[PDB]
Structure formats: structure tokens, C-alpha cells
Amino acid sequence: ESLDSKPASAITAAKNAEVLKNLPFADREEFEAAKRGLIAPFSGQIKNAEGQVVWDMGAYQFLNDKDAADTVNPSLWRQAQLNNIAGLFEVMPKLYQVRGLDPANMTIIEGDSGLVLIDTLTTAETARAALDLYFQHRPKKPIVAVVYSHSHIDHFGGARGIIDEADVKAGKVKVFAPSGFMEHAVSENILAGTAMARRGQYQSGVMVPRGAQAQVDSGLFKTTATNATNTLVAPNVLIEKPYERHTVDGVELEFQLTLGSEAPSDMNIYLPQFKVLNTADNAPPAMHNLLTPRGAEVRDAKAWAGYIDASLEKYGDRTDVLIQQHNWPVWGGDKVRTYLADQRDMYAFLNNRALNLMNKGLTLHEIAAEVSKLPGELDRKWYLRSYYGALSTNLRAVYQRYLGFYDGNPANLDPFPPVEAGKRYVEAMGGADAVLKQMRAAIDKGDYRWAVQLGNHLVFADPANKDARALQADAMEQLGYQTENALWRNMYMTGAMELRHGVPTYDSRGKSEMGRALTPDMFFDLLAIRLDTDKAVGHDMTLNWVFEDLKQDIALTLRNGVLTQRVGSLNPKADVTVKLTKPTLDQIAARKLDLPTAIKQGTVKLDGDGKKLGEFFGLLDSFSPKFNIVELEHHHHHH
């Protein structure tokens, strides 16, 4: 059994050939839209400080001016080609966009004295690159203001690389963000940080080679930035009312809060002076995720449809061009009004259809199996295809939002862990060889979906079974070859690769500077996650923390291996009281500055039992950024 990337099976090739026949030949419409306003193309590379590649559009040349290969869904191939169109774009005079230099776009508005930006891209490196491409064709001006459209890393991530933290803290640079920005940005990207960043590798397929038999696109972007720096700079002005009008450097900004739709902290930006609506990631030219593969809170499709309709009503009649923080604009009022109506209907359908079927007694997987397509004319639009969000996943996500993972059947009340279930199922099926025979029967039949279910049990029962791994990877690859969903392709390709070759050595948060924006409260919330309860039991203690810089008191309590904190108060009977600054704390937990060294230097001043502070830091776990996904967890010692 081979570990090599197999060609498309006859079944796969035939399946893709049939997709070619049934695609809307409306063609060039989105190509003309993606090309319109192109000032300077980009096909090059973005490198980091150490000369490592961060971004590379050149890797995708195989897509340009060529027809779809048998190993890639033709509809997916079309989207991939559109996403190859990168560079600096002029929407209108004074209104620019840098697209395809990062997963997200950067909107640049030319003000009276400087520049007003909508989003800062994913990394410092890509943010800098995007701004440099802009400065190659437009005069050098300072950044006067920044808008964070939502709490997603691809929008706030590159902030520090282009703006100064001190200028934001001073109010010199206005940084706008929707209600609940930090809370949600830190929960998603920091608190559940390690899990998300790793799961995200499957979503983007970053470590998978670029080619017709591997990584081709990610639906709303190509892939993610490698070997780069994620940053976080807290906003200065928060959008709290449903609508807020603010003018900065002679630029009229009209914010529409869209909380709990695409992101927990989210908003649209209307530009009155331009007759342009920036729909952030609320209406991209593909079905978005109600539940993201990387892992984040469920999204509300009802609210999402409501917010879209609100934009269509409030701005639809005064918008000449719709711009987004992913992909190309939509030109002309007529087209924008149709687009928004179509977008709204898609989210409303996802919600209402699932609730209709839920109330009929259908469970998550029954619902996903019964709704095969978008209704009426929605199935005929290019901008509504499941390139990013999957119809099945989104239907399952509505079920999750309203009811949860549990289907109501008590036989599913207490599922076994994958290894325990794997061993039992393999035995029940006649042992390893019997499952391998059935896997081969399924692959021959072209039932790749069943073969992956079969193989997963075997791989989890015995990760040392090489035939099981090769067959599992072969079936996933064929599934990836067939899928129109870019994210599903990426997940399947990553899975295939990791089954065959193991997990590649890469950490998305390696160079991450997001921990700087963290308040002491946020910081202790992370320590509460890091704390090893098993080790911490029998070590009840109270630690008081006084931040001389922030004039903030935190009462930390460790009880029964559980860490809780109180902001603004101090415990009178605290085992220890720690006097320091936020920077000093950062260094100690990041293992940059040693504890007795800080006491020696006088940066840390203790009152009471200092041993207790040392033992507290000894109870904290350190999360490895690598973890097995397609096979069981790498243990550690012998079992």
C-alpha cells in the first residue's frame, strides 16, 4: 500500500466531468468584477525578517489560464482562479483595496491629512507589505484612523506592524471596533488559542503543498500566512449603539452593528461620501460558516439575515459599489440590491429550514441529508456556492445553536472516546483485516465517505496499522478531489498528508505578540486555563496582585485546584501580595524574566509567603502547539 498522492479515480474524474456540464456559464461577470480597478498586480512573495516565505501567490500559477484538472472540482477551480487576482485596486478616487496579499483585504481611504483604514490584515508582515504596495502608487501619508470591522485575526492581526500602540493608548490614532471586541478577540484567539490555531491548519491547508492534487484555494482566500507575527492592539473608540456616525480626518464613517452574525463582535461600514457599503465578512461571494472548522462560537443565521436586510433597506438605494474584507466588489446599485437580497435569503433559509425540520423531529445528520441545495434561484448564483461554508455543516450548526450536539436519542447520550469506539467497532466488524476488506470494497464502489468512517475506527484502534492509514488517506484524497468546498478540500488534504507523513512541525502562533494587549484580568483568565487542577489540588492559596502602573488590584484564589479572580478587590488574609507592573508580569509567565531575579531587581515586591508565588507558577501547564487530529494523541510513555 502506497503513501503517494494517487490520481483521480475513474469515478472521481467522471463525477467532476458532470460538474463541468451543470455550472452557470454567467462566467466573466465575476472575473470583470475581480479585475476592475486594478492599479498594480501582485504575484510575488512576502518574506519575514529571517527571509522565510510568509505569502506566495506564485505557488498558484497552475490555476492561471488553464482548465480544471480531473483532481479538482471545476466550480472550485473557477473560485480558485478568481482568488488568484491580487494587488492594489481603486474602487473610486480616494478609496482603495489591497487584495490577495493576505487571507483578508485592507481598505484604504484617503482623508484630508492622512489615511483611514478598514482592517489591518492577519500579520504585521502582510500589513506592512500591503501598505508598501499602496505607497508605491500613492503619496506617503500617516495613518490617522483604523476600523476593526470584527473580532477576527485576519482583520486586527496586523495592527502593530503599521500603527503605534502608544499613539492608540494616547488617542493620537483613532481605533474603532464593534461592541465586545477584546472580550471576543481574546476568548477565540487566546483562551481557546492553541486548539483553534491547530484546527485552523486543517481549515487553511497551510502545510499542504500547492498543486492540482493538493492545496488549491480556501474559498475566501488562498490559504494562511506562514512564519508570520499575529498582533493585537486594543481599540480606543467602541461602537455600542445599533448605528453610529463618526467623522475622522474629513471621512464620514457610518457603522452598523451586526453582533453575533459572522463574528461575536462585528459591524458593517457605510461610506456616505462615496455611496459605498463595506459589508466586512457579512456578505462574501460564497456561503460563509455558521460554524467554523477551526473552532469558534456558533453563529446566528437569523440575526445574520436580519442584519443583511437592514443594510439592504438602509443603504441599498444609496450604494453604487459594495466592498468586502474578503474578495472583490459588487458594482452598480441593481447588482448590489440583488446580491444583498440573495445573501439574506440564504441565511434566513439556513435558519428557517433547519427549525422547520427540527420541529418535524429531524436530527442534525437527517437534516443535512434531506436538504441537498439552496432553494429556487439561490442554487443558480455563483456568489452563493458552498466554497467556504458548507450547506450540510451550516444546517448541522443551526441544530447545534438551538438544541446542541445531543440528538435526543439516549443511545447517543454517552458516546465512547474515538480509540475505545474504534477498538469495539473493529472487533464488531470482524477485526482489522475484515475492516480493510470492507474499506477496499467501499473505495472500489466509490463510497469514499463510508471508507473514511470505516478507516477512522481502525486508525484509532491501531495507529500502527499502515494499510489502514494509506487507505484512509486515499479515500480522503478522493473526497478532496470531488468537493466544491475549499475548506473541506483543505481539511481532507491535510488529513491525507498527516495520515501518510505525520504532523508537520509548524506553529501558527510562534511569533505571536497578541499577549501584549492582555489586561491583568485577561491574563489571569489564561492562567486559570493553564492551571493543572490535578497538581493544584491540596495547594489552596490566595495571592493578591497590585498593579502600580494601572492602579488595579486583583485578588487571586486557588481552591480545590480551581483558579478564580476578583478585579478591584484585595483579600485581607492573602497568603502573599505581589506588587509589580503589567510588563513585569508578562515576562515572568513568558519565562523571559526569572522570579528571584525580578525580586533582586526590585521589579517584583512581595509581602507574605513568597514560596507560595513560586509554587503557583509551578502549577501552570504549557500547551504544545502540535497535537494529533487524524489519529490518537502521541503518548508520552508506554501503555
Residue numbers at the binding site for Zn ion (CB under 5 A): 104, 152, 154, 281
**572 scored as a contact of a copy of itself (CB under 8 A):** no
Length of the chain measured in residues: 639
Whether residue 70 is annotated as binding a ligand: the answer is no
- CB distance 357 to 370 below 8 Å: yes
Element (H, E) at 345: helix 333-358
359 binding partner (options Zn ion, a copy of itself, none; Cβ < 5 to 8 Å by kind): a copy of itself
Phi, psi dihedral angles at 449 (to 5 degrees): -60, -45
Is residue 184 a known part of a binding site? no
Please state, in angstroms and rounded to a whole number, the distance separating the CA atoms of residues 284 and 325: 8
8 A C-beta contact, residue 339 and residue 383: yes
**Contact between 414 and a copy of itself per CB under 8 A:** yes
Burial class (CB in 10 A: 0-12, 13-18, 19+), 410: exposed
- Asked if 265 contacts 177 with a C-beta cutoff of 8 angstroms, the reply is yes
* 139 vs 538, beta carbon nearer a copy of itself: 538
Cell, residue 1: 500500500
- Annotated ligand binding at 489? The verdict is no
Give whichever of 560 and 601 is closer to a copy of itself, judged by the CB atom.
Answer: 560
Is 290 assigned a ligand-binding role in the annotation? yes
**Angle, vertex CA 608, rays to CA 604 and CA 610, nearest 5:** 55
CB of residue 164 to a copy of itself, shortest distance in Å: 31
Contact 251, 172 (CB under 8 A): no
Contacted entry of Zn ion, a copy of itself, none for residue 104, CB cut-off 5 to 8 Å set by kind: Zn ion
Could you tell me which of 485, 291, 483 has the C-alpha nearest to residue 387? 485
Cβ 113 to a copy of itself, closest distance in Å? 40
Would you say 299 and 5 are in contact if contact means Cβ atoms under 8 Å apart? no
Consecutive H or E run containing 280: none
Cβ distance 18 to 446 under 8 Å?
no
Q: Which cell numbers in the block locate residue 332?
A: 452598480
Choose from a copy of itself, Zn ion, none: what does 587 bind? Cβ within 5-8 Å by kind. none
According to the annotation, is 388 in a ligand binding site? Answer: yes
Least spacing, CB of residue 611 vs a copy of itself, in Å:
21
Helices (H), 83-191: 124-135, 153-156, 165-170, 181-186
State the Cα–Cα distance between residues 574 and 571, nearest whole angstrom: 5
Site residues for a copy of itself, window 421-450 (CB under 8 A)? 421, 424-425, 428-430, 435, 438, 449-450
Residue 610 CB, nearest distance to a copy of itself (Å)?
24
Angle CA 437–443–447, to nearest 5: 115
Q: Is 368 in the site for a copy of itself (CB under 8 A)?
A: yes
**Closer CB to a copy of itself, residue 248 or residue 476?**
476
Q: What is the CA radius of gyration of the chain?
A: 26
396 touches a copy of itself by CB under 8 A? yes
- Report the residue number, 121 or 374, with the smaller CB distance to Zn ion: 121
Residue 112, amino acid: D
Q: Which of 51, 410, 572, 602 binds a copy of itself (CB under 8 A)?
A: 410
Nearer to a copy of itself, 115 or 476 (CB): 476
The entry of Zn ion, a copy of itself, none that residue 630 binds, CB within 5 to 8 Å by partner kind: a copy of itself
Determine whether the annotation assigns residue 117 to a binding site. Answer: no
Residues forming beta bridges with residue 330, ordered by sequence position? 322
Please tell me the distance from the alpha carbon of residue 411 to that of residue 508, in angstroms, as a whole number. Answer: 39
Which CB atom, from 123 or from 393, has the smaller least distance to a copy of itself?
Answer: 393
Q: Which residues pair with 542 in a beta bridge?
A: 557
For the record, the C-alpha cell of 19 comes out as 460538474
Asked if residue 281 belongs to a known ligand binding site, the reply is: yes
Of 43, 453, 552, 581, which one interacts with a copy of itself (CB under 8 A)?
A: 453
Annotated binding residue 29: no
> What angle separates helix 520-530 from helix 582-589, to the nearest 10 degrees?
20
- Give me the least distance between CB of 51 and a copy of itself, in Å please: 31
CB of 425 to a copy of itself, least distance (A): 8
CB 156 within 8 A of CB 148: yes
Distance separating alpha carbons of residues 303 and 261, to the nearest angstrom: 6
The least CB distance from residue 54 to Zn ion, in Å, is: 17
**Among positions 51, 93, 417, 572, the unique one binding a copy of itself when judged by CB under 8 A:** 417
Q: How far is CA 190 from the centre of its chain?
A: 13
Residues 168-207 contacting a copy of itself, CB under 8 A: 187, 191-196, 198-199, 202
Select from Zn ion, a copy of itself, none the partner in contact with residue 416, using the beta carbon and a kind-dependent cut-off of 5 to 8 Å.
a copy of itself
The 328-367 contact track toward a copy of itself, x by CB under 8 A, reads -------------x--xx--xx--xx-xx-xxxxxxxxx-
> Residues in contact with a copy of itself, total (CB under 8 A)?
121
For residue 281, the partner it binds in a copy of itself, Zn ion, none, with Cβ less than 5 to 8 A by kind, is Zn ion
CB of 281 to Zn ion, least distance (A): 4
Residue numbers 528-547 binding a copy of itself by CB under 8 A: 528-534, 537-538, 540
Q: Restricting to residues 477-506, name those near a copy of itself by CB under 8 A.
A: 479, 488, 491-492, 494-495
Cα–Cα distance list, 483 to 65, 490, 495 (Å): 21, 10, 15
628 binds, among a copy of itself, Zn ion, none (CB under 5 to 8 A by kind): a copy of itself
Residue ranges for the known binding site are: 150, 152, 154-155, 203, 262, 281, 289-294, 299, 326, 388
Residue ranges for the known binding site for sulfate are: 203, 289-294, 299, 388
